[PDB]
Amino acid sequence: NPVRRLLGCLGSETRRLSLFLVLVVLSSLGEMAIPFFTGRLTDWFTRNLTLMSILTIASAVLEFVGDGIYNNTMGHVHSHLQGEVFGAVLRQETEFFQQNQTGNIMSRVTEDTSTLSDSLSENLSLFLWYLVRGLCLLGIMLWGSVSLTMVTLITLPLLFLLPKKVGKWYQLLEVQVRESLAKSSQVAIEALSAMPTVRSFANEEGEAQKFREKLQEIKTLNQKEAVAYAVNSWTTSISGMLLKVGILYIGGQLVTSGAVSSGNLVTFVLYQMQFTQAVEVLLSIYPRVQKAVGSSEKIFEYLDRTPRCPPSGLLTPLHLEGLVQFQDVSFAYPNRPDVLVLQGLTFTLRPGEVTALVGPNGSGKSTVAALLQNLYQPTGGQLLLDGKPLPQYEHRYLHRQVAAVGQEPQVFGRSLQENIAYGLTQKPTMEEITAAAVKSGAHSFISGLPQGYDTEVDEAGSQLSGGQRQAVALARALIRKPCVLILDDATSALDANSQLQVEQLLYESPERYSRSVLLITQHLSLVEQADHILFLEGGAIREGGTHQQLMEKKGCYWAMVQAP
Amino acid sequence: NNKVLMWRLLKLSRPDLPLLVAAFFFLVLAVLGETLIPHYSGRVIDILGGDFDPHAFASAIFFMCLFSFGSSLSAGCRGGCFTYTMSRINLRIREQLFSSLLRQDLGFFQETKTGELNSRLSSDTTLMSNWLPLNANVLLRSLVKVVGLYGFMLSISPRLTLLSLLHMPFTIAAEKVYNTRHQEVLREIQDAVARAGQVVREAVGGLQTVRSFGAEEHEVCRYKEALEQCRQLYWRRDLERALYLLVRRVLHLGVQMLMLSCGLQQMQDGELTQGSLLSFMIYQESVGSYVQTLVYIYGDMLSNVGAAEKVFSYMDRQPNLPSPGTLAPTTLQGVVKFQDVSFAYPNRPDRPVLKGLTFTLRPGEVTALVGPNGSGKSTVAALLQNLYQPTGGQVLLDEKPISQYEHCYLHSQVVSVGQEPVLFSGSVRNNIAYGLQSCEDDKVMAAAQAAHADDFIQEMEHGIYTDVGEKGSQLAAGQKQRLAIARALVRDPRVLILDQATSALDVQCEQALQDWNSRGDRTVLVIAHRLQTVQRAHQILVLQEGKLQK
């Protein structure tokens, strides 16, 4: 069954493969017909010499053209396969990337596909060429003697019987080989991505030992691979030898019986010696086909998997209010589906108003922020944006209308300009980028760099301090002019001077009338001017109201504030 | 140039000698066995042609099958041995490359990308693996049969064999140009593949941000645009290879024609007989094919090793680090001194960061370092941990330079909590006891209670045996920071560095952790922006624009 899945990828190029097959057949026939046109070479002078000269040149040119076409098509096939595998990977739900680590996914996408494509490219061409040669020899053999051709063709399935038995074992070995390679790659990636910490704790030897363990497992599998190779070679050669010997012996009985002359037998044997080599090559190809089937299991599982997240909608309204309503929302992470992180949240975000969400560590604030960004779906209740459920909006439009500053934000390895303008389809002008950088306070140090906004940044943002990374993330969120703005500890690493910028943005900027703001922080003095304060503990809202009301109640909020 | 790399590969393959010797022995047996099958094939086909005599027929056939059986066994053993040798060489290369990469200085990891390094570890070591077990085997098998075919030819017509050395079936000039271009295109292909892999690394590593900005399609387009260049390079290589093979085919045809003309001339003058001419032509066809095969194999073998030079460059790079230290005293007071320290990062040496700092830390006191963003506090913390070397001045630990202490000893006495800490995949226990060869569970529990981490560890699925996920992504920020604090407290350090270790902690928990030096035996450096926590300090250092203010 999986062989048809493998061969299905060639359905987009059938015309070019048909042309290649035609060229191969034509070259084989052009090379095959020479003896009939030039004799024994003992009958020889100029004409017979020039004839084979011309035929050899024509065959060489035809082979060149065929190889060019085939090698041109296979590169397109390989690139298309890799691109579609990556595209299918990126469509999966969020927890799929918690279950599968980065190194495993990278190894599956970049390494398995290359091996599959290379094996296909070599094996298909080899199979076609030797099949054509085998048929061209079979025709002459059938012309020589029908009876011996029949008694040869009758015994062919018995040779293929044995490889069909042990085919599954090659797949079951290759699966483990690829899995071990991916496991080693994950360790390598994780070790290299955090070198300062490993150096700080002097743990190079531990990482080396972790790598060595996976290498040992791979070493364990390779011995079985080699032994299987040797045994298969023995069996194939034995089958070929016996196939020659049986028919050769039968020919002796025929000639001794006086039924068939030796003249026919000599030619039939001389062509059997080559037909057997052809079928032996075709026998040798099959285990590599099973190996390739084994190598492609995980990428095809990626391709055929159905995402568990809902698909994107169609709504793209021109004007959006930004009103957000939570209605009895409950949530539990998929890997622990029996622990309710959130229980019955009910509140509303309204344009022009700032809502502060406070609570102890591990109470579920960032879970609410992730739910608001449609990264996860609630397991109970409803979450409505301007009266519509989140999935009904288009994927690109929704995340343009909702922007968030994540906790400990990430910065990609591009220029600062492209980092600020990340994710936008209509590329903004330099004036918009400069204004956005000025609002977040990043302009004061970006302009001091030797190349300004063209400065390159490493893949982890290592060339920036924590406050600078936070300012860049804030500008990246501000550039889109969102309707709902989410701040998740956006002031943890910002000094006292930069927090003034956030305060002006929240409570004094003239653009605040067009946004709904959800402020999550442990810096309690920042939320004193919030229109609503929600205290979240244990996944449930204990109390709410303005700062004065919560101070008067002398509840959890008052106890938290008064402690120092 | 490539000879040195080939010699290095030969030096590396020493642990595989007891298997390579058997591989070559089986190769010799198989090459001996293969030559004798056609003899008995001919001695059987003529028995079919002539009088039957069944006894002779059967006797010839039995020997035929016996020798075919022997050659088959030899070939199978040779193949198995060479495959195992290739696998061993590949694994050894990978292990050495990773162990060498782990030694490099921190500047090396900013000039390169992680995805590129991983794409050097994978799919690049295979080319270095294919050299000996694959290319040299076929090269030797071709050479040992070329010499035999020439030996057979010498008996027929020495004059014709001398004429056979006419320019050979190949031109040396074409081989040189093709070998020059092939290595270059292979190197370009490898670089393009690494650049393509980096895109997947970035896109999969930070997927939640991409989701939050809805930019998956942008990343897919970038990946496809990167794949296109690799496709073009592959086509450029393949077309040239095909053209070169066509040219060699034409050359072989021409040499064949000239040789047949000279053989016909020898026929016309009566110097040769037809059977000998036919045998000579058969041997000549074989030789003319095999010489071209040999030359092509040698060229490819050199080209792959030449193209794989980046891995050898990585394996040999000398770290930009001082000589390893040796000091490891039984007792350490913990006095730290900065003396006119000036520093600028190696990747940007024209912009100084520190401009002549000087201060002292003493046991039993808490010292606070404060300043605005970009003022160099984390740079001071990194310099104190010997992650970077100062460009001027000295850093002294108990009157010894910091770089003279043993690497494993130094990082057990000077421990720090980093800004935005990072955790590794695995259990909570393996993250708390990170970097320790042996640690008791009682110490782990005591360290967890010291950082107020038990009260949320007890709520996990398996307690301290629960997995935290990649980068600690299955934890809250405060929980991750508490685990980072416990990882430092479990070691009982003499000098403790807190690089804003309470940024994500809530108000209540921050109060219960200000007792950093209750026993009065540590040296504590506290880096903070909040003016609340600095009130407990005995010495306050204000850092602005890279200079200590008065």
Binding site: P35, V281 | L278, E285
Partner: peptide, 29 residues
């Protein structure tokens, strides 16, 4: 006619043999 030329026969044999050298060198190991 029907008859086989030994020279062309081995030419065919060598063509069948060397297909695996310039392409799929892995199979010859």
């Amino acid at each position: 006619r029907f008859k086989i030329c030994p020279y062309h026969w081995y030419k065919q044999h060598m063509s069948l043999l060397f297909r695996r050298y310039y392409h799929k060198l892995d199979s010859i190991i």
